Paper text:
Sub1 orthologous proteins, including the human [name], have single-stranded DNA (ssDNA) binding, DNA unwinding activity and multiple functions in transcription and DNA repair. Nucleic acid binding is the key factor for Sub1's function in DNA-dependent processes such as transcription and DNA repair. F77 is conserved in all Sub1 orthologous proteins (Interpro domain IPR003173) of nine key species, while W89 is substituted by tyrosine in the proteins of six species (rice, mouse-ear cress, fruit fly, nematode, budding and fission yeast) as well as MoSub1 in Magnaporthe oryzae. In order to determine the effect of tryptophan/tyrosine substitutions of [name] orthologous proteins, we have determined the crystal structures of the DNA complexes of the [name] [name] mutant and MoSub1 and analysed the effect of the [name] mutation of [name] on DNA binding affinity.
In order to evaluate effects of the [name] mutation on the configuration of DNA binding, the [name] mutant-DNA complex was crystallized and its structure was solved at 1.97 Å resolution by molecular replacement. The asymmetric unit (ASU) comprises a single protein dimer and two ssDNA chains. However, although the wild type and [name] mutant of [name] have the same conserved DNA binding motif, the DNA conformation around residue 89 in the mutant-DNA complex differs from that in the wild type complex. In the wild type [name]-DNA complex, residue W89 interacts with two nucleotides by hydrophobic and base-stacking interactions. However, in the [name] mutant-DNA complex residue Y89 interacts with only the dT5 nucleotide base that adopts the same conformation as in the wild-type complex. However, substitution of tryptophan with tyrosine in the mutant disrupts the hydrophobic patch and also results in reorientation of the nearby residue, E93. Additionally, the analysis of the DNA binding affinity of the [name] [name] mutant or MoSub1 to the same d(T4GGAGGT4) and d(T5GGAGGT5) oligonucleotides showed a similar affinity with the wild type. They also had the same trend of increasing affinity with increasing length of oligo dT, indicating that whilst the mode DNA binding is altered as a result of the [name] mutation it does not significantly affect the overall binding affinity to GGAGG linked tandem dT5 or dT4 ssDNA repeat sequences.
Numbering used by the authors:
A (entry chain B), B (entry chain A): 62 to 127
The structure:
DNA sequence: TTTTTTTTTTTTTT
């Protein structure tokens, strides 16, 4: 499943080799004319994603103040 | 501002060259004994961060179904 | 070999 968050950026959810990854990732268009994941991104495991969600309120507080 | 989401992973919030960035990134310990940002990570702008949050429910549903 | 916004490019450590 892919969830667009910008022009060339997605959160993607996939099973990779038995484990669920939540990937926040910029994509590019390659010379053969296909969409590929780029170097800018990180694949989170479910516990890291859970910790991120738990800190959204604090993250938002910091964003708001800048 | 730093928000830990794993042993060596953080969300950070900062103003860089006049732009607020929400960076999700893996860090490492370098040979001099200092923490440094690593190559696995992505800096979101606030609009991307807002779209990510908007889709957490859908992302979470994908995780349950994969 | 190691950041940082809408070419040379994936994939999990509290």
């Amino acid at each position: 499943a892919m969830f667009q968050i910008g022009k060339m950026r997605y959160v993607s959810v996939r099973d990779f080799k038995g484990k669920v990854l939540i990937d926040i990732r910029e994509y590019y268009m390659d010379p053969e004319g296909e969409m590929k994941p780029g170097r800018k991104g990180i694949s989170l495991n479910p516990e890291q994603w859970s910790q991120l969600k738990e800190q959204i309120s604090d993250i938002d507080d910091a964003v708001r103040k800048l």
